[PDB]
Design a protein around this ligand. Structure first.
Ligand SMILES: COc1ccc(CC[C@H]2OC(=O)[C@@H]3CCCCN3C(=O)[C@@H](C3CCCCC3)c3cc(OC)c(c(OC)c3)OCCOC/C=C\COc3cccc2c3)cc1OC
Length: 126
């Protein structure tokens, strides 16, 4: 997470560093998911300080959602939108792009900075 702080690319339209990304593994894909595409990922998630660890692997199930429909935090609609199939991205997220000053307790404290390792398994339209 500190690495992303230093090295991570800004992928916010507004470029406020609210969302930062390192492409760790390059995908075989040439396409990215469109808004309204059903998205299939593996993911690991923690607060910046390593607390509240969560993963699709542990839940024995991929995390499936439709892109750009606010099913997930702003940071995910922005971040997975940049990703290619087979790609693994690292994300460091400002609370403004996650749960904000209100947070979401008990899991998400007030003004929490999140870290995600996401693997984009696939995406489909229709
Ligand atoms: C439009 O804005 C929102 C959209 C959706 C939500 C609800 C939470 C949502 O989760 C997320 O947005 C992100 C990104 C997708 C992976 C999960 N996630 C989380 O933030 C994680 C959180 C990662 C950081 C360590 C603590 C757990 C994360 C993981 C959680 O448990 C797996 C979690 C949670 O809620 C605070 C956040 O618990 C609530 C869900 O209980 C279990 C049920 C379903 C599985 O979790 C889901 C399902 C769908 C969406 C999410 C969780 C709040 C939003 O407000 C900003």
């Amino acid at each position: 997470p500190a690495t992303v702080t230093e090295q991570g690319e800004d992928i916010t339209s507004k470029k406020d560093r609210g969302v930062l990304k390192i492409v760790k593994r390059v995908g075989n894909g040439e396409e990215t998911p469109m808004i309204g595409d059903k998205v299939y990922v593996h993911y690991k998630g923690k607060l910046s300080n390593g607390k509240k660890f969560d993963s699709s692997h542990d839940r024995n199930e991929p995390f499936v959602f439709s892109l750009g429909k606010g099913q997930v935090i702003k940071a995910w609609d922005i971040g997975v939108a940049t990703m290619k199939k087979g790609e693994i991205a690292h994300l460091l997220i400002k609370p403004e792009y996650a749960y904000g000053s209100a947070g979401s307790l008990p899991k998400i404290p007030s003004n929490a900075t999140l870290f995600f390792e996401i693997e984009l398994l696939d995406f489909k339209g229709e």
